[PDB]
Write a sequence for this structure.
């Protein structure tokens, strides 16, 4: 369908330590309703609607220099939540599992007074956001 | 709506030379049906459906080292096309405007015999894919 045209089909990201990354994403994408698509020795993909998220193991010869979200390339990914309650729930989960929570001083309005969201970090230091409608 | 839950809300990417990048994305996102959302001195965002794409100027002190899609972080973004014809059309456009076309030796099946797509590079060397249904 031409209706799908322009929608994002998939997004592929190289990760430093696959195992650790898969632990985080399985959890988050799990909490957000994604299902596993394909898993292999060097990666894993997840499905939601008509868009996939694919994570691959960074090759040895390319693990250095390490990823920095301030540099050219990816800064962050943001996802929709059904409600503020969901954002609150995720925030609490994050704290428990120890995933880094950003801008705690302004949470859940670090993005502005009319922007209700949690900002965190995946194991690669990639910034991740979940925003309430 | 809880129906939106888990969908990607937006994706933010730092770019090396904003002007050049905006030239490419305006064109591509233009060809894919996106509309401009917000433009400022250091960036620009585009809208399609319920998801936005945001491009920001990489800070001076962070332009080095340059982006490499093989390293940890973003490798590529892929988008849906309505048809093979659209993919062919985009390929021809790419060649004309001189944007780099990848895996020309296998095009439009560089991704496999049952994967019809064009792979190219944005001005940052970020890999970009448009895939036929
Ligand atoms: Zn954001
Ligand atoms: Zn792809």
């Amino acid at each position: 369908n031409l209706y799908f045209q322009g929608m994002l089909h998939h997004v592929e990201i190289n990760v430093d330590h696959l195992e650790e990354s898969i632990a985080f994403w399985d959890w988050l994408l799990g909490e957000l309703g994604y299902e596993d698509y394909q898993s292999w020795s060097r990666g894993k993909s997840y499905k939601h609607g008509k868009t996939y998220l694919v994570f691959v193991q960074t090759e040895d010869r390319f693990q250095t220099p390490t990823f920095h979200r301030k540099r050219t390339g990816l800064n962050h990914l943001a996802f929709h939540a059904a409600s503020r309650e969901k954002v609150d729930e995720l925030t609490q989960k994050l704290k428990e599992r120890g995933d880094p929570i950003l801008y705690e001083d302004r949470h859940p309005f670090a993005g502005g007074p009319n922007h209700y969201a949690v900002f965190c970090e995946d194991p690669n230091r990639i910034k991740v956001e979940i925003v309430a409608p």
Observations:
- Residues 18-31 of chain A form the longest helix (14 residues).
